[PDB]
Amino acid sequence: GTLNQLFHNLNEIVEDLNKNWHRERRTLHDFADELHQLVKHVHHFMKLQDIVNQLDKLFRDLDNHLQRKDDTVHHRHHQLNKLLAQLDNLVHR
Amino acid sequence: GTLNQLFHNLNEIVEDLNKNWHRERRTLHDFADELHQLVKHVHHFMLQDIVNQLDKLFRDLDNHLQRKDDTVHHRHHQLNKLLAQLDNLV
């Protein structure tokens, strides 16, 4: 009865979390791509080497960050869904 | 009963969320710091269509990070309420 309240509340939180992740992931992936583009671009222009090198380092840091983000969100996402399904079962029983 | 397993599991999940945010936040702020220093370096170096794009990216990320701080603040305050309530029920 109150268990129903928490389920509702958690379900909403987990949906919100998912939606934010979709938004973040797009924002950061476009971000990276534009970085990529600008690294390609600077490499087409050519002293200016410190700049391109540093952008390349930054592209790869981010790129590395997003891969690990994908894996981490994938795991938490299944752990929260698993848990919501358990709540679902326990409330209605 | 089994609402114990559910509480404990959610506790752990919420702590991991929290841990991974601080790791996240750090990684991206440092990343933004460099980007800024870089923009600021090139600005003084400067064709110049690139500093425009560079300064665009910086605020793109800076915006994202301020937004995130707020979003994370809200979510975690919600999950704290919920856990408190859940452990109250056990």
Instruction: Give the whole-angstrom CA distance, residue A76 versus residue B16.
Output: 9
Contact predicate A24/A91, CB 8 Å: no
Question: What are the distances in angstroms from CA A10 to CA B37, B45, B58, B80, B83?
Answer: 41, 52, 35, 11, 10
What was the structure determination method? X-ray
CA distance B42 to A46: 15
Of residues B16, B68, B73, the one with CA closest to residue A20: B68
DSSP state of B47: -
- Domain boundaries defined on chain B: 3-88
- Give the gap in angstroms from C-alpha B38 to the nearest C-alpha of chain A: 8
Best CA proximity match to A83, nearest among B62, B64, B17, B35: B17
Tokens 């800024």 correspond to B36
Q: Enumerate chain B positions whose Cβ falls within 8 A of a Cβ in A.
A: 2-3, 5-6, 9-10, 13, 16-17, 20, 24, 27-28, 31, 34-35, 38, 41-42, 45, 50, 53-54, 57, 60-61, 64, 68, 71, 75, 78-79, 82, 85-86, 89
CA distance B11 to B86: 10
